[PDB]
Design a protein around this motif. Structure first.
Motif: not given
Length: 226
Positions: A64-68, A35-40
């Motif tokens: 697949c964690f990119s925010r489109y 939702t926020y294109g965020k990875l930790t």
């Protein structure tokens, strides 16, 4: 499937590596919030010292964690292939040095997004920036260009990483990437566009093992038509 990604989803990463014969393994874990294109994420070398600089494996270690943005939803190839997943292959050419070839499967295993990787590196100079560990522990911001490759029902991706060298110069690492769905269902083949990614590297103050903490923001852009 996008909805698979509406909230925080756990991630697991496994890498088995061999570079110029130095064998190593790395395990990682963390979360992604598309939702926020965020990875930790946090990675640990479990075979001892990591034989190549950490930054060189950043791209190897889940698009697949990119925010489109909404208006670009039909161009999100990565989510479209889930939960069955996609195979992601690359050749990464380090300028004036050796190269990495990687093959990965990114798919759900339960409610966890897993990226399982095999990497072989060859032709590295024993004393160049890589095997010689001359790269700084930082990362620059980059754009990742994506195009469809209809033949293989996947996408082709190309971008060049600028790794800062301890001298003030930059070691380029040219990435040739291809992704193909593991599943048989239909997947979305996008129109050309790119992802903009920012990466922050750090260390876990309590960890004795050679490791890397990576926080990233990644967003798709470039399409205003349709």
């Amino acid at each position: 499937g996008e909805e698979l990604f509406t909230g925080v989803v756990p991630i697991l990463v496994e890498l088995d590596g061999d570079v110029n014969g130095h064998k190593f393994s790395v395990s990682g874990e963390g979360e992604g919030d598309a939702t926020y294109g965020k990875l930790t994420l946090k990675f640990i070398c479990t075979t001892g010292k990591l034989p190549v600089p950490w930054p060189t494996l950043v791209t190897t270690f889940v698009q697949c964690f990119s925010r489109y943005p909404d208006h670009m939803k039909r161009h999100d190839f990565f989510k479209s292939a889930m939960p069955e997943g996609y195979v992601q292959e690359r050749t990464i050419f380090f300028k004036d040095d050796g190269n990495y070839k990687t093959r990965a499967e990114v798919k759900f295993e339960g409610d966890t997004l897993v990226n399982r990787i095999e990497l072989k590196g060859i032709d590295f100079k024993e004393d160049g920036n890589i095997l010689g560990h001359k790269l700084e522990y930082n990362y620059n911001s980059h754009n990742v260009y994506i195009m469809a490759d209809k033949q293989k029902n996947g996408i082709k991706v190309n971008f060049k990483i600028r790794h800062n060298i301890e001298d003030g110069s930059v070691q380029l690492a040219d990435h040739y990437q291809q992704n193909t769905p593991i599943g048989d269902g239909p997947v979305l083949l996008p129109d050309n566009h790119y992802l903009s990614t920012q990466v922050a590297l750090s260390k876990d103050p309590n960890e004795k093992r050679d490791h890397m903490v990576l926080l990233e923001f990644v967003t798709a852009a470039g399409i205003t038509h349709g």
